[PDB]
């Protein structure tokens, strides 16, 4: 049926979503999972939201990513309006009009990370690693745990993803190209890619490797 999580709300606001859920027999939970059908975001007047994990796992799963205005309006009009009509256009980083969630809902047959082996390497922040990994699998990539366990051959295309911020070492991520043969890039490659639901030419994200 319908199962919701919310992102960016206040308790007051959450309470309104709850009232909504009660009226319409919609399930409402704290954590996002496979079953989650909807992701309710705090947006501005033009449905521009912030980027949060739920936001990403939302698009990645092709869930409904809908502005909080879906709720209040539905309450205000004593009935449940169309998700179609309140969907989030974009975000405060990737643009007000990119229609990410849209694409997704209609691309579950060709996922942006078809034929990719991704290895999320090293420490991350604000986002547990297994979640970033879950993210990329939802997009069709294949997760790999250790640099040395990329699937050699040609069949596939490997990629190492790092978040430089969270490192406590001097010269050590400039030198991944020593222990494997994959392009290296920042998390922003994935997040950006998932936001837009477009595969971002590695170009802008590559990290330079000590020969």
């Amino acid at each position: 049926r319908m199962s919701m999580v919310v992102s960016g709300l206040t308790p007051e606001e959450f309470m309104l979503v709850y009232k909504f859920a009660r009226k319409h027999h919609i399930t409402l939970t704290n954590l996002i999972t496979e079953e989650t059908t909807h992701v309710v975001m705090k947006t501005d007047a033009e449905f521009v939201c912030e980027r949060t994990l739920k936001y990403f796992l939302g698009i990645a799963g092709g869930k409904w990513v809908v502005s909080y205005f879906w709720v209040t309006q539905s309450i205000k009009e004593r009935k449940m309006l169309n998700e179609h009509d309140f969907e989030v256009r974009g975000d405060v980083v990737n643009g007000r009009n990119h229609q990410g969630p849209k694409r997704a809902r209609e691309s579950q047959d060709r996922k942006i990370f078809r034929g990719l082996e991704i290895c999320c390497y090293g420490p991350f922040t604000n986002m547990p690693t297994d979640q970033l990994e879950w993210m990329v699998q939802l997009c069709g990539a294949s997760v790999v745990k250790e640099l040395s366990s990329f699937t050699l051959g040609t069949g596939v295309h490997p990629i190492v993803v790092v978040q430089p911020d969270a490192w406590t070492e001097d010269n050590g991520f400039h030198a991944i190209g020593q222990m494997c043969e994959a392009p290296v890039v920042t998390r922003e490659w994935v997040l950006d890619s998932v936001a837009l639901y477009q595969c971002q030419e590695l170009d802008t994200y590559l990290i330079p490797q000590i020969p």
């Binding site: 992102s7 960016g8 912030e50 980027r51 949060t52 980083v93 922040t125 604000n126």
Partner: peptide, 4 residues
């Protein structure tokens, strides 16, 4: 939630 953290934002990015």
């Amino acid at each position: 939630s953290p934002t990015f």
